[PDB]
Amino acid sequence: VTEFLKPRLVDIEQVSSTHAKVTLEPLERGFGHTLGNALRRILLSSMPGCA
């Protein structure tokens, strides 16, 4: 149908108020890895801040 499945997350756990654990469900059969990888590579390197 070319209309995908967008997730319906269940939890945003916020232990320690600075160390979060988000969950998302569901994704396509391969979208999990692709979104995780893109987000990781962006957040590690390309994320404007200050130091």
Partner: peptide, 14 residues
Amino acid sequence: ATILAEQLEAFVDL
């Protein structure tokens, strides 16, 4: 998420 959407902006058409 916003930074990647801005990256993509010049491609999507909706």
